[PDB]
Structure formats: structure tokens, C-alpha cells
Curated annotation (Swiss-Prot), chain A:
The keyword RNA-binding does not apply. This is Large ribosomal subunit protein uL30A. Belongs to the universal ribosomal protein uL30 family. The lineage of its organism: Eukaryota, Fungi, Dikarya, Ascomycota, Saccharomycotina. It comes from Saccharomyces cerevisiae (strain ATCC 204508 / S288c). InterPro entries: Ribo_uL30_ferredoxin-like_sf (IPR036919), Ribosomal_uL30 (IPR039699), Ribosomal_uL30_CS (IPR018038), Ribosomal_uL30_euk (IPR005998), Ribosomal_uL30_euk_arc (IPR035808), Ribosomal_uL30_ferredoxin-like (IPR016082), Ribosomal_uL30_N_euk (IPR012988). Component of the ribosome, a large ribonucleoprotein complex responsible for the synthesis of proteins in the cell. The small ribosomal subunit (SSU) binds messenger RNAs (mRNAs) and translates the encoded message by selecting cognate aminoacyl-transfer RNA (tRNA) molecules. The large subunit (LSU) contains the ribosomal catalytic site termed the peptidyl transferase center (PTC), which catalyzes the formation of peptide bonds, thereby polymerizing the amino acids delivered by tRNAs into a polypeptide chain. Disulfide bonds: none annotated. One of its GO terms (cellular component) is cytoplasm. Gene3D superfamilies: Ribosomal protein L30, ferredoxin-like fold domain. The keyword Transmembrane helix does not apply. GO terms for biological process: cytoplasmic translation; maturation of LSU-rRNA; maturation of LSU-rRNA from tricistronic rRNA transcript (SSU-rRNA, 5.8S rRNA, LSU-rRNA); ribosomal large subunit biogenesis. Keywords: Cytoplasm, Ribonucleoprotein, Ribosomal protein.
From Swiss-Prot, chain C:
Coiled coil: none annotated. There are 2 genes for eL18 in yeast. It is found in: Cytoplasm. Keywords: Cytoplasm, Isopeptide bond, Methylation, Ribonucleoprotein, Ribosomal protein, Ubl conjugation. The keyword Ribosomal protein applies. There is a cross-link at residue 115 (Glycyl lysine isopeptide (Lys-Gly) (interchain with G-Cter in ubiquitin)). Pfam families: Ribosomal_L18. This is Large ribosomal subunit protein eL18A. Component of the large ribosomal subunit (LSU). Mature yeast ribosomes consist of a small (40S) and a large (60S) subunit. The 40S small subunit contains 1 molecule of ribosomal RNA (18S rRNA) and 33 different proteins (encoded by 57 genes). The large 60S subunit contains 3 rRNA molecules (25S, 5.8S and 5S rRNA) and 46 different proteins (encoded by 81 genes). eL18 interacts with NAP1. The modification N6,N6,N6-trimethyllysine is found at residue 49. GO terms for molecular function: RNA binding; structural constituent of ribosome. GO terms for biological process: cytoplasmic translation. Component of the ribosome, a large ribonucleoprotein complex responsible for the synthesis of proteins in the cell. The small ribosomal subunit (SSU) binds messenger RNAs (mRNAs) and translates the encoded message by selecting cognate aminoacyl-transfer RNA (tRNA) molecules. The large subunit (LSU) contains the ribosomal catalytic site termed the peptidyl transferase center (PTC), which catalyzes the formation of peptide bonds, thereby polymerizing the amino acids delivered by tRNAs into a polypeptide chain.
Curated annotation (Swiss-Prot), chain D:
Component of the ribosome, a large ribonucleoprotein complex responsible for the synthesis of proteins in the cell. The small ribosomal subunit (SSU) binds messenger RNAs (mRNAs) and translates the encoded message by selecting cognate aminoacyl-transfer RNA (tRNA) molecules. The large subunit (LSU) contains the ribosomal catalytic site termed the peptidyl transferase center (PTC), which catalyzes the formation of peptide bonds, thereby polymerizing the amino acids delivered by tRNAs into a polypeptide chain. This is Large ribosomal subunit protein eL21A. GO terms for cellular component: cytosol; cytosolic large ribosomal subunit. InterPro entries: Ribosomal_eL21, Ribosomal_eL21_CS, Ribosomal_eL21_sf, Translation_prot_SH3-like_sf. There are 2 genes for eL21 in yeast.
From Swiss-Prot, chain F:
It is found in: Cytoplasm. The keyword Transferase does not apply. GO terms for molecular function: structural constituent of ribosome. Present with 54300 molecules/cell in log phase SD medium. There are 2 genes for eL20 in yeast. This is Large ribosomal subunit protein eL20A. The keyword NAD does not apply. Belongs to the eukaryotic ribosomal protein eL20 family.
Length: 222, 51, 185, 159, 58, 172
RNA sequence: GAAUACUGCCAGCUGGGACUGAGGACUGCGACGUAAGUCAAGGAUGCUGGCAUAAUGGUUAUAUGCCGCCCGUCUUGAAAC
RNA sequence: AAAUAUGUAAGAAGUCCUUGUUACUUAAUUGAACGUGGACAUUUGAAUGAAGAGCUUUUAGUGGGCCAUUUUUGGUAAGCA
């Protein structure tokens, strides 16, 4: 008659097991991250014990943010900004670093600040400024149903799987990052320091590669 | 109609990511690390303090 | 401020409604935009996009083109569709007794079809019969065959028939066209 | 004032390759050109006939016609807001084959062979070549490689 | 008052505004500059192969 | 530049088949960050050895803390710098507690007197002098007298108020 | 054998202050609870008081603080001596 | 003999294997070009991005320019050309 109770209960029974598998996936991801950092710590200790030098592997991921405004940009950097999707000041994206990208980065250097981000910043940034590009329409995420719908064909069921694919730079990184809208960040809350901004970071400025001090800047301005 | 962000509004933080409950139970940010009593080499210390 | 790469606030360039104010055309549009919304068939979308067009882009299609269409393999007993007008052709002497659907019929065409034993129906009746394009066959007439397209693209080494009122000698049959009067195009 | 003849501002490009003046190889005359081949244009000053214009030096294009002592080349010339299609007729002394065509060809051949072997083996065809990835971890030893403490040097003239 | 000859400023701007573009290569391209000795025989090769396809179809 | 730290930096000129296992150079650097430290490392190592960071490898960077930061010391400091006409070497002596605070005082003194910025200074050598009676400077060896004692007549007090009622003094 | 600095993390605790309250029967994703239901969970509700007045708001004049060169036009360029 | 700039290419329109036409070519089905039937079944052949790509028609105003950074010519130099 009403013919709604069975459908509703079935819906709940299905999304319940979705919640379950999401939980047991996130747990494994947590174990993976903590094991990964603990092992490199013990490695850097063991090499010192042996009288050696364990080098760290190069970073695979770069978060980059725009710094300069819109006016008086030459054409080739302008196009590179358009290709990295930085159409706006205080906008940001992620990048899979390689030879094809590092040339763009040294080319775009006097207009951005880029660096090596962390899981904490990725989480804290995606959860707050998480928007997705689907028929484009810039939808806020707010639910894993969207992600199941538009990235179920890559095994990405949830926002935690998304940040996993981003950190562990996986095969589906292009699709995930392009699905992500560019992050519309604000200005830093305690300022930039550094009263003159458009010098390099090394000469007492902002632009270029701040390697790990990007996690402070983004956590301020986000 | 309105975006309630996580990192406040625990209801949203639990709508997303149900692992947060157990993360708070074990608390898993104040996790202690087991003690390891290794020691570096005299070569490393000499190269460090050498001028 | 934001950097732009294309034009913003642009029109799509496509017509989304007929320029006429004909009531029956508007009713047909209402029908087919219900259908194309609610039946996920391409035929209805094609049909309304054809309904929106202008008279030069919905040309007349001869009654003889339909015959060579039906001469196709398998298309012997299909329903022909024309978003436009059909026209008689005295050059054909035989005709089958098929079913033709369009919105304007010449009297010669109507007589020819019903004399063969066919049917002269509307898109309304077509939607009642085959609501989502079952065993249909759309025909379109020739666009570029009209006269004004002769002149489009007029330039040297083009063969594009200059705009001219009076023809014959003394009218653009000279310098620029002869090998003797200087040069040829 | 300004002169714009056919061989203006070509004092140096039609010159000949110091200590390689004079006659030409016959390997150039023995080379075989089909249709569709990719050829890089480089003029020759010894041969006055079949000479391309100075614009087409260093360019490259596809071949569309073949004659007794020449070939018909296609080029895409930039002019204004469009690329026009130019048809050259060039003798063989002013031309050569492209090596990227042959290396792309043998890459495709390697791809066919590797796909056959990967179908025989199973998974991991892996034909797409990727750029230079970032490096990975490692351990540097000090055995026989003790670090030496360098320092910047003073200033001296020794002019 | 003089007459300024030229200035290439802004011309590349005008070009890249409407987007300098490629000539849209086509399948089965033109055949006008080609050797007629080859074209004349290509014609009859096509005659014969069309005839032979018609014979094989029947 | 900033409030400074000291690092050791190690570089490799990463290997090939010609020269696997290269010679693993080291440098002691003063700077406020790992980033600036390794930038300066590649600067000096490019000046000396045939290498740039496009062909190199930072195997280790390690901070260095002062051994006895509660014990006052005397540091001889050899440097070079670039003036508006040429470049000159220089020797100074700094009585300070730390190898890095001495460097801060050095950079400030050079900027004050010679108007030399950070970009035009190279620290050739910092070295504590262990024994006394090897100082070469009056302004240092006057602080080494037995039972040193001095006032500062007419110190200034940066009072907080704007209207006082006391016509204050300046007694030390 | 310690603590303390420095850097970093907590899906860590606790307070103070400012701006906003869009939308308008239910539907959804969730959380607590055995349950019933409850909830900070797809946009604010509750309680109390004051004003019959100029309480509020508007219009106009005046005063005050800051800013404000005469329109049209030829022009690369006009407040233009 | 640089640096900066600069041409081409990074596939399914292709790769391999049978077999058909020619009045062209070859000493010669020998070759050339175009096809015929299978397999290689879109990891179908670098990175990034795409506010979709392409095609037409018709028509306005404009067809005196100027400043700055770098490379420059003439000039004593110029808010010079």
C-alpha cells in the first residue's frame, strides 16, 4: 500500500554496509600512514647507528598557490597559470611533480608559492574547502554519495579514499585532482611575515619553494 | 542550502568518516611510541662536531 | 579579480525557440519538448531542433526523394518524417503507398500519395502512433543548392558566380576573365 | 630603399660547411622518397636549381609528389591569423629524411612486439613512456668516502 | 608632419585574439600538383577495380 | 637575515657509471632555515667543485647546537666581502657566548660600518680562540682585565607615562 | 638519568568578543537510545520588557569630519594661459 | 659556438599477415598507388588543462597613437627622431 517501508529499510541496510567498509578502509589507511612514518624514522636512526646517511626519497606531491594578482603577467606564465587552473589570486591546487612540471614551476616561480604538503593540511583543507566539478556546477562535497557517484569507477568511495589517492599519488590522481575544484583560499590570518612579498623566499620574500613551511601558510590562510 | 564544515560540528564529522569515533576513543593523536635505545656512530658524531 | 580566456556572458549561438508566433507551431513545440524531456529518445530532440529552424534551413523536399529513400534495403515499410514541406515531382511516374508525416503538404503531393494509397498525416498523429521514433526515417532537403550560396565566398580562383543583375556580354566578361584583356582571375 | 629579392639576406645559410665545399654525395641521389615520408629541408649552394626559398630552410614537411629529379613537398606556413598550405617542388640535393619518423616507427614496432609478449605472459603491458620520475630513498656509505669539510676561499688577485 | 612607416606592435595581439589556427587537414587531399603521368593511370586503375568489385558483387 | 642557526650540509654529485660512489662533500653554514642553508651550500659548492643542484644530491642536513652555550668565549672570524670598488678580506674578534650570536653581531657590524648586506659577505672561518693573550684587539682585550668594573652614566629610562610630577634623575 | 627549549600533530579540553538568521508542511544523510522517541543532524527558536510617543524610518535646511577642479569637443594627452 | 626563441612527431586515418585493378613502371607480378579479408580489440601508444569543437553569412567604427622595461641606430645631447 504505502510501499515505502521495505525500500527505506533496504536503503538503510545498504548505506550501513557502505559506512562499514568506509570505516575499515580508513582504519587501514591510518595504519599505513603511521607505519610509513615510523619506518623512515627508524631507518634514519639505523643508518646513523651504522655510520651512514639514509637519504629521504624525493617528494611526489606539491601544493601550489597563486601570489601575484592578475595584472601585468607575460603570456607564457599566464598560460601556465591557466593550465594549472590558477585563474585567481589566493587560489591553490595540487601537482604530481615530475620533469614535465618542475619546468613549469621554475617558469611560474615569481607568481606562486609552492611546497611539499602534509596529510594534516590536506585533510584540514579538503574538509573545509571541498568542492567538486560535475556538470561543472561546483558542488560542495558534504557527503560520500557524491564521490561514490562520480568516482565509483576508480574505487574512490569516500573523501578519505580521495585524500589517500592524493597523498599516495596513485593512478587516478589526474581524475581526482581534476574533479577537485581549485581551492579558493583567503589571505593569511597572521599575515605573511615578510613585508615585501614579491622577492624569493630565500632573499626574504614569499615566492618560490618553501619546502615544508607551506603547511603553515595554508593553515593560516585557510 | 548551507555548508556546515567539519572540524567543528561533530555531527558532520561523523556523517563523514565514521572512523573518527574510534579515533577519539583511543584518541590516536597522543599515541605513545615505544622506546628504542639505538645510538649513533662515532663517525657521525665526529663529522658533526668537526670544524 | 579573475583571469578570463573566453568570452563570458555569451549567447550559445543556437536557437532554442521558433521565431514565429504561429499558435499551432507553438503547440507542437510544447508537445515535443514534453516528449524529449520525458522519453530519452533522440528523435524528439532532433524534431524540436528542426522545428525551431528558419525557412531557408527547412527547405522543401521533393516527393521523389522519398521514393529513392524507400528504395533502400529494409526501409520499404518505414514511416517517413519531414520537419518542413513536401513538393510534387512530375518527373516520377510510380509511387508506393507508404505513410508520410510532415506539417505542410502541397496539393499535388497530397493527391499523389493518396492516389497511390498512402497517408498524409501530421507530427501530432505521428507522436500518437510512434511516440519515440519507431521505424522512422527522417529526410532533409538541400540547403546549399539555393541561389544565394553561389555568391558566398566570392574571390579570385574560387568559381563563385559574382553578384550581378544583367548578364551577357558587356556585363563582366572582360579584364579579369580573359587571357587577352590582361589577366584571368 | 629596401630590396627584397629572392635571395636577400642569405649570405650565410647557402654557404657550404667549411671544408665540405665542392661536389655532393651520391647517397643523396640514391635515397628513395615515397609519398607520405617526412623530410627536413636544408638547401645547398652548389645546386642553383630546385632551390627553396629562405623561409623553408630548417623546416620539415610531408611529401606528396615524385618526379624525375625532384619531389613535391607540403608545408604549413603561418601568415596572419591562419596557417596556409604551401606546395614546394624541390630537387633531392636540398632535402633529407627525418630520423624521428624512423625512431617513432621502431618504437611502434617494439610496442607491437612487447604487446605480443605481454599477451603471451599476462598482465602489465606498460607501453606508455612516462617522464623522469622523482628519485627514491637510498643509503650512502662513508667507507673510503669520509666527508671533507670545505669552506669558501679568500680573495686574491694573481692577475 | 611625417608618415610613420610601420609598427609591428599589437599585430601579434590581434592574431592571438582570434586564435592563429591550423589549416584543417583532410582525408583524400587535393591532387592538382601531382604528376599527370601518375594521375592518368590512377584513373584507369580505379575504373578497373570498380568494374571488378561490380563483377564480384553481381 | 634573521635570528640565526648553524647547520651541516652534505652533498654528493649523484653517481654515474663513470664515477659511482662520489666524494661526499660537507659544509658548515649559518642561516635561519634548512632551505637557505642548502641554497648557500649549492652556491659555495658550485663555486668550488664542478656541480650544481641539477646534478647533485643532498644526502644529509643536520642542525648544530652549541656545546657550552652558557660559557662566554672569544671568536676570531675571517671573512671576505665586496665593496663598491672591489672586494676585501677582513679579520675580526668577537667576545660572545655562541658561535651564531657572534655571527649575528658580525653581520650587523658589517652592515653598520661598511654598508655590506648579506648578499655580499662570505664567512671564511669562525674559530674560538682557546687561550688568552692571543687576541689582537683592544676592544676585546680590555674586557679581560682582572676585576673589571664600569658604570654607564646617563642611561635613559623609557618611561610609560606622558605626564610626570617628579622631574626625575639619571643616577645609575 | 633528567627536565627545558625549538619544530610538528591531536577526528584535544576550556573561556571571552563581533557580524549574520537567508529559506518556509514532510521527504535526506547521520548521531544517542534496547525501545519509544530524542537531537546542536538538507538556513533561529524560546523567554522577558518598553513605546502612543516622534520610538523607528523617510524628506528638507543647518552644523561637523573626510573627499570632491567646468560641462561639451578636437586630442596620444584638457581643470587648462 | 651558446642562452632565449624556432620546425616536425609522439598512432586505430595506425602495425603485421593473405589476395585484386592499372592504359604507369619494371628484364620480370618486379615495383608504385589504391583496395580485399583476419589479428593487433581504445595501455589504442608522453605531461597538464579544456568556460566544447567546427562551419558560414552580414555589418559597424578604426586605418594621427603614446608611455615604461630590455636590445638598439642616427645624434653633442634632448621631455629628440
Amino acid at each position: 500500500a504505502e510501499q515505502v517501508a521495505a525500500e527505506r529499510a533496504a536503503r538503510k541496510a545498504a548505506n550501513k554496509e557502505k559506512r562499514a567498509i568506509i570505516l575499515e578502509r580508513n582504519a587501514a589507511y591510518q595504519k599505513e600512514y603511521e607505519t610509513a612514518e615510523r619506518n623512515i624514522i627508524q631507518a634514519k636512526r639505523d643508518a646513523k647507528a651504522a655510520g651512514s646517511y639514509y637519504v629521504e626519497a624525493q617528494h611526489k606531491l606539491v601544493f601550489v598557490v597563486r601570489i601575484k594578482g592578475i595584472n601585468k603577467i607575460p603570456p607564457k606564465p599566464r598560460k601556465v597559470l591557466q593550465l594549472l587552473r590558477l585563474t585567481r589570486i589566493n587560489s591553490g591546487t595540487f601537482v604530481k611533480v615530475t620533469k614535465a612540471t618542475l619546468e613549469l614551476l621554475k617558469l611560474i616561480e615569481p607568481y606562486v608559492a609552492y611546497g611539499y604538503p602534509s596529510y594534516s593540511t590536506i585533510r584540514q583543507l579538503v574538509y573545509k574547502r571541498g568542492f567538486g566539478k560535475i556538470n561543472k556546477q561546483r558542488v560542495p562535497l558534504s557527503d560520500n554519495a557524491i564521490i561514490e557517484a562520480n568516482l565509483g569507477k576508480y574505487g574512490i568511495l569516500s573523501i578519505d579514499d580521495l585524500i589517500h589517492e592524493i597523498i599516495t599519488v596513485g593512478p587516478h590522481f589526474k581524475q581526482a585532482n581534476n574533479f577537485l575544484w581549485p581551492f579558493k583560499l583567503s589571505n593569511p590570518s597572521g599575515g605573511w611575515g615578510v613585508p615585501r612579498k614579491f622577492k624569493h623566499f630565500i632573499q626574504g620574500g614569499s615566492f618560490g619553494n618553501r619546502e615544508e613551511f607551506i603547511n603553515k601558510l595554508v593553515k593560516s590562510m585557510n | 542550502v548551507l555548508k556546515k564544515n567539519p572540524l567543528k560540528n561533530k555531527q558532520v564529522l561523523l556523517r563523514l568518516n565514521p572512523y573518527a569515533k574510534v579515533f577519539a576513543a583511543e584518541k590516536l593523536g597522543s599515541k605513545k611510541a615505544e622506546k628504542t635505545g639505538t645510538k649513533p656512530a662515532a663517525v657521525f658524531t665526529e663529522t658533526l662536531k668537526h670544524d | 579579480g579573475i583571469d578570463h580566456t573566453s568570452k563570458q556572458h555569451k549567447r550559445s549561438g543556437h536557437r532554442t525557440a521558433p521565431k514565429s508566433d504561429n499558435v499551432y507551431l507553438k503547440l507542437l513545440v510544447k508537445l515535443y519538448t514534453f516528449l524529449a524531456r520525458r522519453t530519452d529518445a533522440p528523435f524528439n530532440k532532433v524534431v524540436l531542433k528542426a522545428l525551431f529552424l528558419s525557412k531557408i534551413n527547412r527547405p522543401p523536399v521533393s516527393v521523389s526523394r522519398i521514393a529513392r529513400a524507400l528504395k533502400q534495403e529494409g526501409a520499404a515499410n518505414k514511416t517517413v518524417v519531414v520537419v518542413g514541406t513536401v513538393t510534387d515531382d512530375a518527373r516520377i511516374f510510380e509511387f508506393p503507398k507508404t505513410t508520410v508525416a510532415a506539417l505542410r503538404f502541397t496539393a499535388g503531393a497530397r493527391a499523389k500519395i493518396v492516389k497511390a494509397g498512402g497517408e498524409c498525416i501530421t507530427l501530432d498523429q505521428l507522436a500518437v502512433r510512434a511516440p519515440k521514433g519507431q521505424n522512422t526515417l527522417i529526410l532533409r532537403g538541400p540547403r546549399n543548392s539555393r541561389e544565394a550560396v553561389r555568391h558566398f565566398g566570392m574571390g579570385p580562383h574560387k568559381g563563385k558566380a559574382p553578384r550581378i543583375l544583367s548578364t551577357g556580354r558587356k556585363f563582366e566578361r572582360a579584364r579579369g576573365r580573359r587571357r587577352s584583356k590582361g589577366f584571368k582571375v | 630603399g629596401k630590396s627584397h629579392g629572392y635571395r636577400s639576406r642569405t649570405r650565410y645559410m647557402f654557404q657550404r660547411d667549411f671544408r665540405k665545399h665542392g661536389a655532393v654525395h651520391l647517397s643523396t641521389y640514391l635515397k628513395v622518397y615515397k609519398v607520405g615520408d617526412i623530410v627536413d629541408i636544408k638547401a645547398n649552394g652548389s645546386i642553383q636549381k630546385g632551390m627553396p626559398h629562405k623561409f623553408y630552410q630548417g623546416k620539415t614537411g610531408v611529401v606528396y609528389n615524385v618526379t624525375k629529379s625532384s619531389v613535391g613537398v607540403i608545408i604549413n606556413k603561418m601568415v596572419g591569423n591562419r596557417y596556409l598550405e604551401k606546395r614546394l617542388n624541390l630537387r633531392v640535393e636540398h632535402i633529407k629524411h627525418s630520423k624521428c619518423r624512423q625512431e617513432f616507427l621502431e618504437r611502434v614496432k617494439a610496442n607491437a612486439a612487447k604487446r605480443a609478449e605481454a599477451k603471451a605472459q599476462g598482465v602489465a603491458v606498460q607501453l606508455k613512456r612516462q617522464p623522469a620520475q622523482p628519485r627514491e630513498s637510498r643509503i650512502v656509505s662513508t667507507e673510503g668516502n669520509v666527508p671533507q669539510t670545505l669552506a669558501p676561499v679568500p680573495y686574491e688577485t694573481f692577475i | 608632419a611625417k608618415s610613420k612607416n610601420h609598427t609591428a606592435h599589437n599585430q601579434t595581439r590581434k592574431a592571438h585574439r582570434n586564435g592563429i589556427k591550423k589549416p584543417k587537414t583532410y582525408k583524400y587531399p587535393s591532387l592538382k600538383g601531382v604528376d599527370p603521368k601518375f594521375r592518368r593511370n590512377h584513373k584507369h586503375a580505379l575504373h578497373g577495380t570498380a568494374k571488378a568489385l561490380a563483377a564480384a558483387k553481381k | 637575515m634573521a635570528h640565526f642557526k648553524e647547520y651541516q650540509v652534505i652533498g654528493r654529485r649523484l653517481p654515474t657509471e663513470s664515477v659511482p660512489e662520489p666524494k661526499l662533500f660537507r659544509m658548515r653554514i649559518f642561516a635561519s632555515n634548512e632551505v637557505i642553508a642548502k641554497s648557500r651550500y649549492w652556491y659555495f659548492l658550485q663555486k668550488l667543485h664542478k656541480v650544481k643542484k641539477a646534478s647533485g644530491e643532498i644526502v644529509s642536513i643536520n642542525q648544530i647546537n652549541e656545546a657550552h652555550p652558557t660559557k662566554v668565549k672569544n671568536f676570531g672570524v675571517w671573512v671576505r666581502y665586496d665593496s663598491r670598488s672591489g672586494t676585501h678580506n677582513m679579520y675580526k674578534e668577537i667576545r660572545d657566548v655562541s658561535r651564531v650570536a657572534a655571527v649575528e653581531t658580525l653581520y650587523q657590524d658589517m652592515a653598520a660600518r661598511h654598508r655590506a648586506r648579506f648578499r655580499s659577505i662570505h664567512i671564511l672561518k669562525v674559530a674560538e680562540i682557546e687561550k688568552t693573550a692571543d687576541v689582537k684587539r683592544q676592544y676585546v682585550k680590555q674586557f679581560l682585565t682582572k676585576d673589571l668594573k664600569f658604570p654607564l652614566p646617563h642611561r635613559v629610562q623609557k618611561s610609560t607615562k606622558t605626564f610626570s610630577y617628579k622631574r626625575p634623575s639619571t643616577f645609575y
